[PDB]
Amino acid sequence: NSIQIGGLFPRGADQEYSAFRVGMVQFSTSEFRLTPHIDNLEVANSFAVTNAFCSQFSRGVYAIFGFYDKKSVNTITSFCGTLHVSFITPSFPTDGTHPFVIQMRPDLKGALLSLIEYYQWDKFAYLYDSDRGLSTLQAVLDSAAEKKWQVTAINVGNINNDKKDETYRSLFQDLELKKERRVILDCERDKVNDIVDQVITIGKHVKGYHYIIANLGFTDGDLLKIQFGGAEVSGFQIVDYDDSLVSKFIERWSTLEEKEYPGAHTATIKYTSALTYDAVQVMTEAFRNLRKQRIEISRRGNAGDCLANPAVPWGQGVEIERALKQVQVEGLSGNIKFDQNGKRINYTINIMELKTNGPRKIGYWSEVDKMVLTEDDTSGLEQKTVVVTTILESPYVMMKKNHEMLEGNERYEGYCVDLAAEIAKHCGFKYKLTIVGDGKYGARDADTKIWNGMVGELVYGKADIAIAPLTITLVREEVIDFSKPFMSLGI
Amino acid sequence: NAFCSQFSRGVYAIFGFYDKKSVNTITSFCGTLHVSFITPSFPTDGTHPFVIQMRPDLKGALLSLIEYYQWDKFAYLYDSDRGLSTLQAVLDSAAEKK
Amino acid sequence: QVITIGKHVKGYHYIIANLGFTDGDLLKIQFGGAEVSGFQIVDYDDSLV
Ligand SMILES: NS(=O)(=O)c1cc2c(cc1Cl)N[C@H]([C@H]1C[C@H]3C=C[C@@H]1C3)NS2(=O)=O
């Protein structure tokens, strides 16, 4: 059953079309085959989108797969909601709940709100690009108003190429006026690779700055530039290279010839191509389940003008979309589920931070569950809160009256408490205030030399330091050491 | 449907309104078919040919009025259906005039 | 390698000990913030030059 479909592809989406050609024969042919008529045409001109859509409807196909631009989303929704033709896409998700659209890209916005709330920012800059749309820009301003944030949002996308070396210099020097430190980028990969190079030229990647990339292929762009900088760069991934089928596709993908499939003989892959691959899995699961339920899709006639007045559609496409919304397989993004509208739920997004060795994950974020860090505590050097022993003596070390409600190093008060804070301020270490157990100053035992008290805590390696009323004698210098004396007294 | 029907009718000059969702469809037909279109609707953003528009721009006057009232901190309630060009405009002057 | 590891901000200061100071690349650290001085024996302003 070679079933007629239609495909829309931009002039330059060569990696994506090659991944579609791979996924075409990656799994098929125990059954029905596909008849893809490919349209390597533009996406900006909605008249061209109209011509291609009426051409493929003149063909009379059952389903159309491809991309759309923000100047075409209204046209695609307006034709598909009329003519009941199910349309599937990997592009940016739509704003309104529209029928007959399945969209392969998950949400980013709740993830990005989770990331900002995890880092606990208050004031930042937001460089956005207009031509991807403004839904995230609308979403962050509401929570910025509620969560008392201070956003300086800046449009950057309409800047031409021929002034594109000094516009960024004026832009970041205006950011130097408020002395910005925290930048969220929201662009395509080309604008990211343009803006990272201009940052690394004007010298803004030292320790102190902090960058969040709002894309899905965090490692799909260049990261060898600002890897060794000093700035810290975080982003998101939906394609995790650790997994079994992922690494299988990596080995399958690397061994292909570049000449037959352009952009294929690399290690990594674009997330757009990954979703294009999973789209074939969904689309074949559809016609699989319709032969499971044995429902015939016989058109039984020709199609005609797309301008038919009034045009009348066929509701077996409604049943096609109904069976599309029930597809649940595993793919490169993980599990998939759909809503009542065609939007994706049941996804998982990995949080990816850049380190010196390279990228690494620190946690995941689900469709309902918030940010769960994976407890990756590779911090090998923790400055230990050192052991400070003392004893209760007025006014050297005294209890407070409200010690149960307070905690720890706040509970004690006196001369020695004030002194130890000065020592730790001058020396930069961490400390915890402890008490000697046996309640003594300490002397040695007869015939066994067992120093008890505050002496043996330092002799026997128990306590680390002792700021306390201790008297320099002759018999104490042999086992512990003393500084210069700080307060004189007598019997 | 209406535009294809009237160009099949052989219209010499097209006039009518548009919302935020059909603006690309009409400018994409008119740039190809070279038909003069006239409108009282909201003005566009990019310089498109064959579109005459009677509604004047606003953003310069509104920025001048904010500078005259001498403000620093305010709220801004918007609707999306007329477009978001003014919202994109006032944020840049917010970035400049702090 | 300096411009990769990020040592050309305002504060650092470099002296090139050569004769063709402009014969090498200077578009890299021109906009940095560091200050770079050197020597020339071939002056492009002159007539025969
Ligand atoms: N007047 S006092 O007892 O509180 C007192 C006693 C002393 C102080 C400082 C004070 Cl405020 N520092 C001295 C040190 C300073 C120098 C000279 C000896 C030691 C080094 N030791 S000390 O003689 O023990």
Side-chain angles (χ1 to χ4, degrees), chain B residues 20 27 71-72 84:
Chain B
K20 79 177 293 295
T27 191
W71 287 358
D72 57 353
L84 276 78

Side-chain angles (χ1 to χ4, degrees), chain A residues 45-47 70-71 74-75 128 134 138 152-153 155 178 307 309, chain B residues 1 4 20-21 24-25 28-29 32 78 84 88 91-92 95 98:
Chain A
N45 194 356
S46 294
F47 174 70
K70 69 172 290 298
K71 292 180 182 178
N74 294 319
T75 303
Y128 67 94
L134 280 79
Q138 293 182 358
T152 301
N155 196 1
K178 292 184 179 182
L307 300 173
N309 196 3
Chain B
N1 191 5
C4 293
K20 79 177 293 295
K21 295 182 181 180
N24 282 317
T25 301
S28 179
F29 272 97
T32 297
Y78 64 91
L84 276 78
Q88 294 177 356
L91 290 174
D92 295 333
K98 57 179 70 176

Side-chain angles (χ1 to χ4, degrees), chain A residues 485-488:
Chain A
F486 61 97
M487 189 175 72
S488 300

